[PDB]
Amino acid sequence: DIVMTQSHKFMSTSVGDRVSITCKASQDVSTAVAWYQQKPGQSPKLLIYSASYRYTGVPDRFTGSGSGTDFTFTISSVQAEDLAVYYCQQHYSIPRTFGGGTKLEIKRADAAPTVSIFPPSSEQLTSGGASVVCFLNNFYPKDINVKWKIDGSERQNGVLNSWTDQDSKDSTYSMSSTLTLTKDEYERHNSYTCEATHKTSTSPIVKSFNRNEC
Amino acid sequence: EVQLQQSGPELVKPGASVKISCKASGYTFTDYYMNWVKQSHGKSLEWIGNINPNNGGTSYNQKFKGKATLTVDKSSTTAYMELRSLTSEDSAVYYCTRSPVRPYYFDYWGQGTTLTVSSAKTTPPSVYPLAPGCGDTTGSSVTLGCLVKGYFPESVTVTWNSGSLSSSVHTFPALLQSGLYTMSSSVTVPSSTWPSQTVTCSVAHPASSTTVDKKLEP
Amino acid sequence: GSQGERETWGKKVDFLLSVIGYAVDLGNVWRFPYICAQNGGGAFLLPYTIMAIFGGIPLFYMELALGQYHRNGCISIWRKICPIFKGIGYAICIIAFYIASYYNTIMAWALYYLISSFTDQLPWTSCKNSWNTGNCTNYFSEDNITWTLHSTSPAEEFYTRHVLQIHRSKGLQDLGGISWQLALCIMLIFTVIYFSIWKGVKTSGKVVWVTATFPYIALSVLLVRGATLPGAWRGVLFYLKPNWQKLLETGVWIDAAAQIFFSLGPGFGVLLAFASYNKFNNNCYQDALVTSVVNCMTSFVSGFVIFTVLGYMAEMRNEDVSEVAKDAGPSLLFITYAEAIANMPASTFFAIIFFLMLITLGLDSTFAGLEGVITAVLDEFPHVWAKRRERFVLAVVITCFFGSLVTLTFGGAYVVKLLEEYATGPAVLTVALIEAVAVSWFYGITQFCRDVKEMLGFSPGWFWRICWVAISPLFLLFIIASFLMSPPQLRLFQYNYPYWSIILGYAIGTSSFICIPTYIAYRLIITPGTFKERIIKSITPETP
Ligand SMILES: Ic1ccc([C@@H]2CCNC[C@H]2COc2ccc3c(c2)OCO3)cc1
């Protein structure tokens, strides 16, 4: 069989920069390599076939090159919607194999994380649960600290951080810090506070609300 | 144009079998090889095998020989893939993709089929409105949310007002714990249409065939 | 008086190149490279030689030694060895007939290509012909093309809808009528063998100078031509890449044994006839040894001749030469190789010498094929026959034409496979086994070593002794059992043969075999005495 090796699992680029993903095959392939673009949440979309030829419906900003074993996929004008995971695949020997997959992450200027704390709703208080939410929207880069405060004390049990993928419009990550608690514990405390430490500013952003019917 | 409409997600207990369809349209069905590619969570694409729609010419991969069985029907232009001896590794997304005979590229793919192989009971999601408090300072935009708690498997869809609008909706991935998933959704909409008009989030769970709609209230 | 002693050959080199001419054919050119590159690549050389040394060579040299020593035909030699097995000589006579029904129609195809190759623009290049469909898509045409399940190449269209016209037949059921072009081609073939056999060993032995040497020339031109082609190393890689794991399969050895046997073709009576017309003092050990080593090495270089052009063809297309070399049979040479040589400078030249090479490969072999049977009948019915040789030779030749009339049909190709797989292989293996057992066990290998000891001046080594006693009949027994156990389902040109074909095949495989148990029944049934008395006088040859 054939082993398609993409040594670089991740590649960082910016909007408008010249990006090029490599692809290493097991043996000599002549000109038999196809490049696929799988956008997050979509089916893999065919971009290049036979090393250099472009497929129909593919903008002019996507090109391909190489002849032999190593092949290269080039994007001249990276757009916000070009954010996807690119795969390379050989099409000469049975069976047809694929590459490990190269996620193209977009680099931009820093953005302040918009933090919003949420009190448990009445339908959940009715069920017998109470989850305080802390949304952190539109910031860059991904590295960000989230610290919880039930009543000023750093709460750490029951905290779940969920990072979404990068955005295809403004290239801004977004994460959710969830603090799930019981109803009995919720009606024995009032002002919840979640804070975020980012590289945009040294002082963590502090958000607070009150339990007494807001 | 060219469309490959696959089947919905499937939750099957380990050791059983499962069949996935692939309705092809928009081209001469007998003019192209029908392929199946496996994609594991976080893994690369994996070629299962192809089939010639004319005579059912299955050409499998040595890694999937006896693991997958490709069939085809010309009377409805639909290709099928059946899987037996289901394990936790088969819990992956499967695509059926069209391909010519030479050069062998995969021009058109299907939307995918989420297969979950687990003996865990199909648990309906708990939809709780994540609404801002009544003491917050209403600025130029308000961020809302809806919480989806406790469900299985990962087949779930959170929509906002029949998809209008959703130009500022941040959907957070689901997290698995003790056999049950939990996710949350948010939406940033200006303050000049709230709370004047109606904003409602709709949570749909296809595996349990349930659909609970909850409207946000301050 | 009268005839008395038999005739003698005109020179040593004539009989050397003559037995080489029988040994070397089409299968040497394309069969061995395919079976080689498929079963473990270069590693296939390891068992192939073994199956040669232990199997092919001993039968070859034993047959040759008996032929030169006894100077009798395929039927008359059993009268003086084991009369009950005289039916063997008859069986071959039937077997050869079945072979001569299809083997020369292939040469007729190569002949139809050859006369159709004199045009400046070769027919199988363009699609604007009277036989192409709307699926025909060809080169020197717009690039980017993406082939379709229903699309078809101009070479496949030419071979399918013209020289074969196989689209006009549905299979074995409906194959008529007859393509008169292939009938005239094969008629010309029977003519060119008619003027090369009718006189006897002198003409076959003189035509062989051309029919056995030219294939090396054409293979040399296509060899140095195919070697200079860009990206030809792919076919060589796929051709000689060692895959030793395939050697663990018990099938591969079987394929090698069958290959070397059916490429040396011992015990068919052709070597008996070719050996009969030689000097008693003349050595034959070196003869058999060298002759085989030529057939094997010739196959080895032929592998390069094919897979170099296949490598270039896999470079212009997209590699993994196996895909461009999937189909083994008439399509590897008549379509893929022809379409490959079409994109080369002075294509008329390489085309003419290629299909001319095919005819040149079949000619010598079929000379010898007929030669064995002719010698057998002339020696079995002397005086009652030999009145003229052109009479009996004319009879067998026109008989082969009427035999090929079933093959000259539209679905004739279908029949060719049914006759190529089912009829010849099991029966020939059987008669080779019974023949080897009868010379090694009944006549006694000791007296055979005394005959060779009287022939060459020295007794054959203990190696030849143990090979004839045990290793060779086990060698044939191996292929017999492995064949009967797993007869093959066969398909040709998107058409699977009906389930009943094997039945038909077995008829054609046994309708030739019925003569030896019925002749044992005829011999043991005709002379009265007791069963133990009559079989003891029927197993011992004539004392005087
Ligand atoms: I079963 C069988 C199949 C093939 C062989 C030989 C093997 C290699 N060398 C040529 C070939 C000779 O086979 C013939 C060819 C033409 C003929 C013919 C016999 O009879 C008259 O025309 C032997 C037995």
Range of the domain at A147: 109-211
User: CB of B36 within 8 Å of any CB in chain C?
Assistant: no
C39 CA → ligand 1 middle, Å:
24
Answer for the pair B33, B129: CB distance below 8 angstroms, yes or no. Answer: no
The one-letter amino acid code at C319 reads: E
Contacts for C251 with CB less than 8 Å, ≥ 6 apart: C39
Same domain flag for A66 and A132 = no
Tokens of A31: 């000109």
Q: How many angstroms separate the CA atoms of C112 and A20, rounded?
A: 55
The single-letter code of the amino acid at C67 is: G
Nearest-CA distance B212 → chain A (Å): 13
C147 touches chain B (CB under 8 A): yes
Start-to-end CA distance of chain C, whole Å, equals 18
- Domain boundary residue, one of A108, A142, A165: A108
Question: How many C-alpha atoms does C396 have within 13 Å on its Cβ side?
Answer: 27
Cβ of residue B2 closer than 8 Å to a chain C Cβ: no
- In units of Å, what resolution does this entry have? 6.3
Under an 8 A CB cutoff, do A99 and B112 touch? no
CA pair distance C76, A26, nearest whole angstrom: 63
Rounded to whole angstroms, the Cα distance separating A179 from B92 reads 30
Distance (Å, rounded) from C-alpha C82 to C-alpha C72?
A: 13
Between the alpha carbon of residue A12 and those of residues A63, A141, C533, the distances in Å are 19, 12, 98
What letter represents residue C76's amino acid?
S
B100 and chain C: CB distance < 8 Å anywhere? yes
Domain that holds residue C440: 1-544
Residue B120: how many CB atoms within 10 A of its CB?
A: 13
Q: What number of other Cβ atoms are within 10 A of residue B49's Cβ?
A: 23
B 70-129: CB under 8 A from A: 95, 97, 103-112, 126, 128-129
Point out the ligand 1 atom lying closest to the alpha carbon of residue C24: 9
| DSSP 8-state assignment for residue A55 | P
CA C362 to centroid of ligand 1, rounded, Å:
9
Judge: A30–C144 Cβ closer than 8 Å, yes or no: no
Neighbours of A167 (CB within 10 A): 17
Say if residue A116 is in the same domain as residue A99: no
Query: Measuring CA to CA, how many Å separate B154 from each of B113, B120, C499?
Result: 12, 12, 50
| Helix or strand run (H / E) with residue C260 | helix C250-264
Ligand 1 and C366: CB distance under 6 A:
yes
* Number of domains forming the structure of chain C: 1
Name chain A contacts of C234, Cβ cutoff 8 Å: 28
Are residues A121 and A88 both part of a single domain? no
Mutate to test the interface with B, among C148, C243, C494 (most CBs of B within 10 A): C148
Assess whether A143 and A68 both reside in one domain: no
Last residue of a domain, one of B119, B139, B165: B119
Whether B128 and B112 share a structural domain: no
Pocket lining: C468 vs ligand 1, CB cutoff 6 Å: no
Q: How many domains, in total, are found in chain A? A: 2
Q: Is the CB of C424 under 6 A from ligand 1?
A: yes
User: What is the chain C residue with the closest CA to B55?
Assistant: C494
- Considering the domain architecture, whether residues B88 and B181 belong to the same structural domain is answered as no
C-alpha distances in angstroms, C46 versus C42, C253, C421?
8, 10, 26
Q: Determine how many CB atoms are found less than 10 A away from the CB of residue A18.
A: 11
* C96 C-alpha to ligand 1 centroid (Å): 7
Domain boundary among B72, B92, B119: B119
Taking each helix axis from N to C end, the angle separating C472-485 and C424-437, rounded to the nearest 10 degrees, works out to 150
Structural domain total, chain B: 2
Coil, strand or helix: which one is C281?
coil
Q: A28 to chain C: which residues are within 8 Å by CB?
A: 234, 319
Q: Tell the residue nearest (CA) to atom 18 of ligand 1.
A: C369
- Closest among A78, A85, A120, A93 to A28, alpha carbons compared: A93
User: Domain span at residue B114?
Assistant: 1-119
In this structure, are strands A102-107 and A85-90 parallel, antiparallel, or unpaired?
Answer: antiparallel
- Closest-CA residue of B relative to C324 is B102
φ, ψ dihedrals at C232, nearest 5°? -85, -5
Query: Are B56 and B164 within one domain?
Result: no
Give the CATH number, domain containing residue A187. Answer: 2.60.40.10
Which residues in B lie closer than 8 A to residue A118 (C-beta atoms)?
130-133, 145
Q: Are β-strands B200-205 and B210-215 bridged in parallel, bridged antiparallel, or unpaired? A: antiparallel
Q: Which helix (H) or strand (E) holds C385?
A: none
Q: Indicate which atom in ligand 1 lies nearest the CA of residue C424.
A: 1
Q: Mark whether A99 and A19 lie in a shared domain.
A: yes
Regarding the beta carbon of C23 and ligand 1, being less than 6 Å apart is answered: yes
